[PDB]
Structure formats: C-alpha cells, structure tokens
Amino acid sequence: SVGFGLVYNSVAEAKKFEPTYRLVRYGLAEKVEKASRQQRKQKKNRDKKIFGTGKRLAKKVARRNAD
Amino acid sequence: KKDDLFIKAIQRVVLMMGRFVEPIDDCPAGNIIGLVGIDQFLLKTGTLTTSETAHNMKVMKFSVSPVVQVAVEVKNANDLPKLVEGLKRLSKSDPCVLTYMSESGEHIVAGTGELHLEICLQDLEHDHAGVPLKISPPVVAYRETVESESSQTALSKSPNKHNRIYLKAEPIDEEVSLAIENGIINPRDDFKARARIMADDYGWDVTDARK
Amino acid sequence: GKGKPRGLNSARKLRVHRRNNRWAENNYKKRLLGTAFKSSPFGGSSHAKGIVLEKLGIESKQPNSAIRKCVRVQLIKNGKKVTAFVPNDGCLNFVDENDEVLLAGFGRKGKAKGDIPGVRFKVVKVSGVSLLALWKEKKEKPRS
Amino acid sequence: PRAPRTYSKTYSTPKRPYESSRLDAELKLAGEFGLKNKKEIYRISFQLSKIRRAARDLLTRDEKDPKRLFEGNALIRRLVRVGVLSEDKKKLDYVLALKVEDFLERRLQTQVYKLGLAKSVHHARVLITQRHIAVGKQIVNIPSFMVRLDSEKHIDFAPTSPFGGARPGRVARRNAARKAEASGE
Amino acid sequence: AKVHGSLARAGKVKSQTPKVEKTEKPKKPKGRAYKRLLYTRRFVNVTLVNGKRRMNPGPS
RNA sequence: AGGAUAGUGGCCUACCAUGGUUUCAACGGGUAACGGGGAAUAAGGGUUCGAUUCCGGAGAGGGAGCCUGAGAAACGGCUACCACAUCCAAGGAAGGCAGCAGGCGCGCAAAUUACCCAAUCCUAAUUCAGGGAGGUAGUGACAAUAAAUAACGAUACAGGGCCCAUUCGGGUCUUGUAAUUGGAAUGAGUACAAUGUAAAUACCUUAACGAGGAACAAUUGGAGGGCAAGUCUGGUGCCAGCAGCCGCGGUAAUUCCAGCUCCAAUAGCGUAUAUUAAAGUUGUUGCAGUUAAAAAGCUCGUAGUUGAACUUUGGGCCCGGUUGGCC
Ligand SMILES: CO[C@H]1[C@@H](O)[C@H](O)[C@H](OC[C@@]23C[C@@H]4[C@H](C)CC[C@H]4[C@@]4(C=O)C[C@@H]2C[C@@H](C(C)C)[C@@]34C(=O)O)O[C@@H]1C
C-alpha cells in the first residue's frame, strides 16, 4: 500500500496544527458533544426569531397565558 | 407467487397530531403511525412487511357493501381523459367506492348509500376534478332472448340475389347458458372433446354437439 | 456555363438561390414550418398516452385480405382522435374500451405503414404494463 | 459546478454490420485469439484506424518535418515497446501494414498461454481473471493489457494462489478436512 | 367496400394453437466459451459441408 | 442652447432645419431564438444541434417605482397594481422554490424532504464561525471504461501419426463425443479484521465460509430478398396474423403461432421521434432543365454578377542560405 506520512515535533504541537478529525481518529481529543448539522440550523433560525435575551417575553407569555 | 409484491422503500415516516405532520426517524411496534412514498402504488388496503414469508391480513369485508350506483360522464368530448383518471384518485381516498366501467361502456361509482354519493361529488366538482360532471341514474344492460321456437325457417336473399341463407331459432337450456360463460363448455376445448362433455352430462345430442 | 452565378463576389446571388431552393426538400420544409409542433397528432413527441374510445376492424389494402383490429384513441394532451394498431396475435382482447394506453410512432415519419389504411400509430404500453410483456405472459393487467 | 470529465468511445461498429466476408474473417480472429465479443476487436480496429490515420496524414510530409520526427519516433517507441511492431523493422510503412493479429498477440491473454501454466488460451484467459498471473509484482486481471516487452520475463503464478503457494485451497481443504470424519466412525 | 369489421374472433390462431412445452436442453456455455465452440463448430467439425458450408440444414 | 446623469449622447427640454434607413432586403412577421466557446456526424467541403459543467446577457409570478449602499431598479430588500394563494378571534397580519431537497398539474420524459464543511473556495471583525456555494453517499442500464457466465482429464473412434498412412483391437503425445464419470482453480456473494471515510457505504486488502445443473441457469432481435442464418417438425387455412419496402398467408406457409436448429449483437439488444452520413435527392466543391419536374412567349432595362489587350523586360555581376563517391 502507498499513502502519506506526517511526523511532528510534539503532541501539543501536533494538537495545534492538525485537523480535529485526525485527533479524534487517534484518540488525542474526543469528538465534541454536538448535535446534528440540520438541528443546529433549526435552533439557529429559532434564535433568529427572538430579538435579545427574551427573558421579558418568556415572562410575558407566562403571565399572559395564565389568564 | 410474485403477484402484486412491490419491492420499494419508505419516503418519510410521520406521526400525526392534528393537521401538522412531522418526519419520524423510527417508530417501534404497537403504535399509530403514518408514512408516505407508497401511496402511489398502494391499493388502499394491504399488508406491509419486509419479507415474503409473512402473510396478508384478512380483507375487511367492510360489513357494509358499496351498492348504490350512479353514472358519471364528462361535459366535453375533449375533456374525457382529463378527469377520467380522478375516478382512481377518489377510489383510493375512501376504502369502499369502486370506480369501474359498466357493461354499457359507462363509468359507474358504487357507494354504500345516498349521502356517501354526496361526499364524493364536491371533490369531483372541486377537489379531484375541476370540470363539472353530469350525474344521471345508471343505465342497465338488458338483453333480448327467446324461448318460443321460431316456426318458419328464416331466410334472407343476399345482395347479389344469387344466394340465400336458411336457418332456425330456438332456446337454450339455462345451465348450458351459464356453462357457456362458466367455461365448462369452452371454445378453447377441442370440438370433439367439448362435444362429448356437452352431449352427455348436459341435455344434448352428439350430432349437434359435434356441429 | 452551368447556369449558376460564379463570380468571385457573387455569393449573395448564390446564397439566396440555395436559400430559396432549399424549400423544396420535404424534410427541411417540415422543420421550418414547425408542422410537427403545429400540425400533427404528436407535437414532436415520440410516444403519447391516450384513452380508448372504440375497437375498430379495418380491411387491409389490396391485395391483402385481413382485419387489423385497431383502437380509436383520444390524445390526452391535445384531444385529437386517432387510431392505433395493436400488434401481435390477439392483444385486442388484452385492452378494453375506455382504458389507458401508450401510443408510439408507427415507423415512417407519417406514412401509414403496411397494408393498414388510415392508422399511423401502434400501441406499446397499456395501463402502464407493456403489451409485449402481456403477450409473453411476463406480467398481467391490474384490475384498476 | 463540477468540472466535466471527458470520455470518448473506444470502438465503432462497421457501417454495414452484416457482411459474411468480414464477419467470418473476424470469427477467425475470435477463435484464434479467444476474444469474448467483437467490441474487443472493434476497439483494436478503432485504435488501429486512429493510429494509422494520424500517421497517414503525417506520412504525407517530407522526411524532415518536426511533427513527424518528434511524433513518429514516439509512435514507433510505444510500438517497439509493446512489440506489435517487433524490435526490428522499425519503419512507418511497417506501422500502416500492421495487422490486427499483431496487436492480439500483445494482449496479455496471449503471452500467458505462451509461457505455459495454461495449455489453452481459454485456460490462459480464465486463470487471468482467476488472479493466477503475477505480471510484475502486481496481478493484472485484464486480457487486453498490451504487454510492453518487460513482464514476459516476469510472468508467473500468483503468490497467494495454491499454484503459487501459501493457501491450501478452498475445496482442497474441504475434502481433506471432511476426510477425517469420512475415514471411519 | 367491406368496412363492417368483425373482431370477436381475434386471436384465432393463438387461442387455438397447440400448446407444446419447451424441451429442456443442456445448459449452453457462453461468452468466450461460446465463441470458442462456435468457431470450432464452423471450422473444424462442420457436420454438413454438403455442396457448400451450411449452417442450418434439416433432415436430408 | 440648456437640463439631467458618474460621464458622452435627443438621454430629456426650448427653438430651428428636414431629414435618417431601404431591393447590398430597410421595415414588418415567425422563431418549437438566450448568444458564444462548442456537441453530433463527417474524405474534403458541409449539415444539424448548442436549455445544459465555461464566458457574458436577462429574470426571480407579471409590470412599475424606490430606500440602502462603492456597487441593486436587488426581489432568500421594500411599496403599489394585477394574478395567485395564507392564517384568522373577521379585527387584521403574513407572501414569493427558475436556490437545495421535496412534494400536483403537465407529459414520452426526469433522483433523497439523506450526511458534511474534510476537500475546493467564498464571506466576516476572521486559524476558530458559516456556507443545500460545494463535497460524500442514496436512486440512476443518460452516456462512457474494463470485462463473470468456466477450466483440466476419458465417452462408442465417428481423424496423416506409426510395422511405408497395416487389421486404426497400438496412449493416433492431437481433434470432437451419451444431462454416464474424477482432481484442481476462481469470483459473484457472505463476513471476521483492517481500512477507505468528516462519519460511513462501496474500491483496493483479507481471515471463516462461498459450485456441479457449477438453478450462482444471459438476454435481446431475427433465419424469402436487403441481411448472417432452415424450403426442419406440428397447427393455422386470404382467418389469425406477420411484414421498415417488396411481399407471406386461398389445406403440405423456408415469412403467421409454436418447438428444434441456426445467425447477429452481447450485459446488452430492439422499438419510437428528431437529426447527420448515405444524399452528387440542395449541388461552392458538385445536380438537372429536348423527351423523365423544370429554359421564362420574346425583347428592353436599373440594381447585382461578369468584363478585351496594353505600361520593368531581359541581361549581367557580387555577396550570400547545398544535396554527393574526393572528412
Ligand atoms: C363490487 O362491485 C360490483 C358489485 O357492486 C356488483 O356485483 C355490481 O353488479 C353490477 C351489474 C354486473 C353485471 C355483470 C358484470 C354483467 C352485466 C352487469 C349488470 C348490468 O345489467 C348487472 C349487475 C347490475 C348492473 C348495473 C350496475 C348497471 C351490472 C353492471 O355492472 O352493468 O358490479 C360491481 C362492479
């Protein structure tokens, strides 16, 4: 077989210039706890629908739905 | 047999809640669930499995049979093929109505009762077809028959005024008439073989059966 | 001689002459009139779906003596009433009136083929299943 | 979007497909060289027509044309490399007179039979796809490999073939294995 | 002329044909093998070269 | 001359004048017209196609208008009208898939509401974020490439072997043969495992398995002529039907249905529509016009095309790039 070979100077030196998937492939850094790409787009667009922190509106729907 | 077995897949899985519908990644057993992608090739009822050794659940007799008939016809001769297809479209929509073509070459929808015809006319008026429809009482397929042994041997001079055809008319045994349709007396049978089976078991003479 | 403009810069008289004389080709005239798109049961299509009106029995041309068992079909896309010849033995019992069939070209850019007069289409698929498969008993006609 | 990938047909059917003269002429090739279909021989014909014509419209020029001398040497180079044109007779006339049979002996399905292990071109053909030829250090699994005069001194059995070694054979294991239970009760 | 076509008896020969079952035949080698045997059958053991080479001669 | 525009310009306005284009085809009409690079075929010329991966143009249902911003008459910006549709508490409010998928109609006709920014790039305050731009996989017999369906022994010897081809009763080390018989090999496939990969499926690698009917069975069109291949067997009897054309079928069909056999192409083979070559049946190359279609009834004549001969020739010289039996 034929492929490529990269040898670095130190583990942290490799950890800083290597793609995240190679690190995950070698167990040096765990895959981040991340949801799917499509759900990320949904929650990003849901965030777009709210202007600001939304505490005032979350309370506002709380009292307005009480009656 | 390889009959009516459709090797396909599922387009989406949906759990219904009101009019809103959402995709479903998976649904375990013992659950109400909806799904798309098979509606086109489905026959409004059946069994869905991932194997051929499984079997089909009993066809629901409906306990209520589609009986009342009414004719359906197009406003325009040019418009005949446009909404002739909608008959199949509505037949899927409701698990009883059976759209077909009657023996008068006319399309009949058979419903369970009076207002079951009502529900399936505005959709043809508006939803499943736009062109209006003329709704008329069905025409039945009668027929003309004799029993009274036409006395004079009929005859007719050919247009050349050279040849003539003598002939007679008389009835048929009723079970023979059924057997002609029922295939017991079959045109596919050999003239010899068919003559034997109709001359002895049914009232006939071997002379006429061979003719 | 030779009866054509042959000057060094006479290409105007040569091009307009060929341009004018080009119209005598039957095939070229069809393209530049758009007769396939305008005046044809098929708008240039190679096939077409239709609905059966009647099953016709047509005497063949002389010297042939046969009945050709055609079907009078209406085109869905333009409503034109045509005829189509159902090939192979029988296969007219295969179809019924007011059924759905696919009509293909019949071989000869118009030019009704064979001893059959007045028909320029042949049936290929009926109700979605190929007539050839039905003839060879590969499939069967669904009752819908 | 994606840049397109260029592809071209490698054959061309005869203008009249049905000629008993050229038909059984190619059946004689098919039987002698063990071809599968005549696409396999049409391809060589299309390659031959391409190569001769490119050398044909170029043979119209003088002996001192830069296109000829530069191309032709390369043309002959691969021809003498493969051996469809032998290591002698390296002239342009020999190229345009080159026979299809000359190409079909440069197919790897030819030289497999020639140096044994086959006793039949069809045995030679089948063992090739049976992965039973080591060509260089790589097994070639095509008949039409157009051998360039090198592997001839390198052709042998596959290293993993039981005819090369290291495997006691699928069925050759099976019958021997169940022989222990078959030797008695 | 005659235009009153009768269609009831369509399919006459097929609906009256003698249904004979296909005779089972030994499996046919095919591929390079077919071209092999086909080449040999018409160049080595040609059973009938009567008058000239013949592909499909009957009982004669 | 001014206005307006970023700027020139009837681009708009005031006044003036009567021009401008056109048989070299203006103008009008059609376009099943986006243009081009190009694609198909192709001796050479051509002919046809070019919606389509690239370069420009235009459009975001139809028009029109406008803010914003360097850059928009933008539409995954806005307003109005028209057309459609959208929820509703009837009070209003929300709209632009010819973006990605995906869902009707329509039709002969066209795929997942899949995964990912890893690659190519692009955007940003920028290594980092994002990108249905793109990429990967799913469907895909659009097309293109390579190429499984099978070897090897002996089956009456039905073949120059040989004692000069005898007596083929003799291995006739080679050619074919009863679905009768034996030993190898191999992928298709299944799957440890690695691995490819962003993560995977496949590819390539590979343990255990995985062939006897090697049911792990290759089909599509044909067998009168063109056009390769039956005057074989049964039926059909101008009927069915076949047949691109000629034509077959009328009781012994080389053409119909079949079976057998054979032929062609082969994981491909037909059918249909259009198109190119064939077509020198569009013609410049390169047609024809007495009779086959076609020389206008004849003449005049503008545009168009075509248009007689004639003017520095010859002779020398010098420099200066050669092939070869006198390197
Ligand atoms: C399940 O659906 C079935 C039944 O409802 C029932 O058998 C119904 O019978 C209808 C008739 C069927 C008769 C035969 C098929 C041939 C003659 C037909 C009829 C005509 O007179 C008799 C009954 C009643 C008729 C009328 C309708 C004109 C039929 C018809 O369909 O035309 O047919 C439908 C399709």
Q: What angle do CA A12, A18, A22 make, to 5 degrees?
A: 105
What span, in angstroms and rounded, lies between the C-alpha atoms of B73 and B82? Answer: 12
What does the DSSP assignment read for chain E?
-------TTTTHHHHTS---PPPP-PPPP-SHHHHHHHHHHTTT--S--SSS--SS----
* Method by which the coordinates were obtained: cryo-EM
Q: Are C106 and C122 in contact (CB under 8 A)?
A: yes
| Angstrom distances, CA of residue D87 to CA of A6, D99, D110, D155 | 46, 16, 18, 20
Q: How far is C12 from chain B (nearest CA, A)?
A: 50
Q: Name the nearest CA neighbour of D42 among D76, D14, D16, D68.
A: D14
| Number of residues that make up chain E | 60
Residue D130 CA to ligand 1 centre (angstroms): 65
Residue E17: partners with Cβ closer than 8 Å, 6 or more residues away: none
Ligand 1 atom closest to the Cα of residue B69 is 27
Q: Print the domain residue range for C67.
A: 1-144
Asked, as a colleague might, if the bond just before B66 is cis with ω within 30 of 0, I would say no
Instruction: Estimate in Å the CA C39 to C1' F318 gap, whole number.
Output: 84
What does the DSSP assignment read for B23-80?
E-S---SS---EEES-TTT--SS----S-SSS-PPPPP--SS---EEEEEEES-STTT
From the alpha carbon of A38, which nucleotide's C1' atom is closest? F115
What span, in angstroms and rounded, lies between the C-alpha atoms of D11 and A39? Answer: 51
Indicate the top mutation candidate among B44, B60, B69 to test ligand 1's pocket, ranked by most ligand atoms within 8 A of CB: B69
Residue B68 CA to ligand 1 centre (angstroms): 11
Residue B147: partners with Cβ closer than 8 Å, 6 or more residues away: B171
Hey, what amino acid is at B22? E
Q: Are D148 and D83 in contact (CB under 8 A)?
A: yes
Q: Name the nearest CA neighbour of C86 among C97, C77, C76.
A: C97
**Does E10 touch chain C if contact means CB atoms closer than 8 Å?**
yes
The percent of chain D in helix, strand and coil, each rounded to the nearest 5, is 50, 0, 50
What span, in angstroms and rounded, lies between the C-alpha atoms of A15 and A17? Answer: 6
Given its phi and psi angles, is residue C3 left (phi above 0), alpha (psi -120 to 50 degrees) or beta? Answer: left
Q: Tokens 């989406």 correspond to what residue?
A: B12
Chain C: touching chains (3 or more CB pairs < 8 Å):
B, E
What span, in angstroms and rounded, lies between the C-alpha atoms of E49 and E40? Answer: 14
Protein-contacted positions of strand F (CB under 7 Å):
24, 31-32, 40, 48-49, 53-54, 102-109, 112-119, 127, 130-135, 143-153, 175-177, 179, 183-187, 196-199, 206-207, 209-211, 213-215, 217-219, 221, 223, 227-236, 238-250, 253, 256-267, 271-276, 281-285, 287-289, 295, 304-307
**Structure tokens, B64:** 């209520």
Q: Are D58 and D146 in contact (CB under 8 A)?
A: no
Q: Are D103 and D148 in contact (CB under 8 A)?
A: no
Q: Name the nearest CA neighbour of D80 among D70, D92, D62.
A: D92
Which residues, in sequence order, are bridge partners of residue C81?
C74
Q: Are D108 and D128 in contact (CB under 8 A)?
A: yes
Question: What φ, ψ does residue C51 adopt, rounded to 5°?
Answer: -115, 130
Contact D122 E32 (CB under 8 A): yes
Contacts of B78 in chain C (CB under 8 A): 74, 79
Q: Are D48 and D103 in contact (CB under 8 A)?
A: yes
Contacts of C55 in chain E (CB under 8 A): 7
- Domain total for chain C? 1
Q: How far is D123 from chain E (nearest CA, A)?
A: 10
**Structure tokens, B40:** 């086109």
Q: What angle do CA D86, D87, D91 make, to 5 degrees?
A: 75
Which residues, in sequence order, are bridge partners of residue C41?
none
Instruction: Estimate in Å the CA C26 to C1' F280 gap, whole number.
Output: 18
Contacts of D122 in chain E (CB under 8 A): 32-33, 36
Chain E, window 9-38: residues with a beta carbon less than 8 angstroms from a chain B beta carbon: 15-16
Q: Are C82 and C51 in contact (CB under 8 A)?
A: no
| Angstrom distances, CA of residue B193 to CA of B188, D107, E20 | 10, 66, 18
Q: Tokens 């069994």 correspond to what residue?
A: B47
From the alpha carbon of C110, which nucleotide's C1' atom is closest? F273
What span, in angstroms and rounded, lies between the C-alpha atoms of D96 and D48? Answer: 9
Q: What burial letters (b/e) apply to D56-87, b meaning 16+ CB within 10 Å?
A: eeeeeeeeeeeebeeebeebbeebbbbbbbee
Question: What φ, ψ does residue D55 adopt, rounded to 5°?
Answer: -85, -15
Question: What φ, ψ does residue B159 adopt, rounded to 5°?
Answer: -55, -30
CA atoms within 13 A on the CB side of B181: 4
Question: What φ, ψ does residue B91 adopt, rounded to 5°?
Answer: -60, -40
Q: Tokens 């097929």 correspond to what residue?
A: E14
Touching chains D and B? (3+ Cβ pairs < 8 A): no
Domain ranges of chain E: 1-60
